[PDB]
Amino acid sequence: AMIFPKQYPIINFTTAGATVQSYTNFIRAVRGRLTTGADVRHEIPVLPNRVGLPINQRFILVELSNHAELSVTLALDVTNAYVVGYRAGNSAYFFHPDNQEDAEAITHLFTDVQNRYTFAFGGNYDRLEQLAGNLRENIELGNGPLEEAISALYYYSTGGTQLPTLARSFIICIQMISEAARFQYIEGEMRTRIRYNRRSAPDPSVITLENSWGRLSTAIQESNQGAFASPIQLQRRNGSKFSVYDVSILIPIIALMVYR
Amino acid sequence: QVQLAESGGGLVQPGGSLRLSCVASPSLDYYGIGWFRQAPGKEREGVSCITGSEGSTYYADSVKGRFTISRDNAKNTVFLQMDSLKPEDTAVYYCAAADPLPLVCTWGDEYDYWGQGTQVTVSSEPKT
Ligand SMILES: [Cl-]
Ligand SMILES: [Cl-]
Ligand SMILES: [Cl-]
Ligand SMILES: [Cl-]
Ligand SMILES: [Cl-]
Ligand SMILES: [Cl-]
Ligand SMILES: [Cl-]
Ligand SMILES: [Cl-]
Ligand SMILES: [Cl-]
Ligand SMILES: [Cl-]
Ligand SMILES: [Cl-]
């Protein structure tokens, strides 16, 4: 019998000739690989609990290609749908782990590369915005930005990309993949940019949703037959705040929740 | 772009049913769809909504249980099944399209495309 090293599943997406259908198909496939056999609470799938999750089920891979015919593979943690690192050619790069258990988990990613690197910084938006020199509100998203971001990640091993541009490229990828997988609303925002072949920065309603995912997951899972103990404040597109008191309002907005 | 056209309205007695259709041309194209209604001299009000790729639904309290919204991508149509109709349901019903739906999907001002409306009339008393 032959013994093979273990593999994590790969989902493909290309910006080359991307359409509303190809992007929607990609996000649906990512969600499907995140939620196999998952628990569902108030119609919303819950991602696996990090505690007790076997290492051979901890990650999924997103292989991104572009019109330049380059390929980079991002690793997503299935417990929060977030990017933990990427591979380009014969090199892999990882955000600084938050703890020693997560540091051990990432050693199982990209076990065919000859060069492995860990950034001293983590991958949260605050830090990446600092390195990029721009907030999310001033970084345009769309197929154009993603096309360029894939090239920038690829060329980081060759010296053609410096860290600020790399951080900007992560901000683009994370929002167009991780946040779109988490939120039907952000999926639609990205699909509309593709539909019109335009790029534009995310408005305050998108940013606040991103910042609120953990708290929304908590409120839903702690609710009393769908009613929140305390209302959650979100933002409209014009920046004004509004309150949400019930899971039923979040059902069209959210697609996945972190385990609580 | 997208163009929307509603059909399926009519006159029914209390307890009757109607199935409204919101047909998108050339394609529904993963747009979310919201249904609204407006009676003479009253404000428009959102009734129900459905998202474009997961078919997640929302209903105003006044129509929960009685109304069911569903999406048929192959027919490029979003349906609103209306059961146990009441006189108070009399109105022109409109469908609207947005991608994504507004965060509160009864916010009509944020939708981008609208149909022309189909009339629903429910008699005040049973027939005969
Ligand atoms: Cl694939
Ligand atoms: Cl439940
Ligand atoms: Cl986690
Ligand atoms: Cl650590
Ligand atoms: Cl390796
Ligand atoms: Cl800044
Ligand atoms: Cl746009
Ligand atoms: Cl969060
Ligand atoms: Cl607004
Ligand atoms: Cl009025
Ligand atoms: Cl309205």
Numbering used by the authors:
A (entry chain A): -1 to 258
B (entry chain C): 1 to 128
Authors' own words:
A byproduct of castor beans (Ricinus communis), ricin toxin consists of two equal sized subunits, ricin toxin A subunit (RTA) and ricin toxin B subunit (RTB), that associate through electrostatic and covalent interactions. RTA catalyzes the hydrolysis of the N-glycosidic bond of a single adenine base within the sarcin–ricin loop (SRL) of the 28S rRNA, a conserved hairpin-like structure that interacts with eukaryotic elongation factors (EFs) 1 and 2, during ribosome translocation.
Two salt bridges were also evident between V9F9 CDR3 residue Glu-110 and RTA residues Arg-234 and Arg-235. Arg-234 and Arg-235 form key contacts with the P-stalk peptide residue Asp-11. Finally, V9F9 CDR3 residue Leu-103 also mimics P-stalk peptide residue Phe-10 inserting between RTA residues Tyr-183 and Phe-240. V9F9 has an Sc score of 0.70 with RTA (0.73 for the second V9F9–RTA complex within the crystallographic asymmetric unit). V9B2 and V9F9 (families 3 and 4) were of particular interest because they occlude the ribosome P-stalk binding site of RTA like V9E1 but bind RTA with significantly higher affinity. As predicted, V9B2 and V9F9 inhibited RTA from binding to P2C11 in a dose-dependent manner.
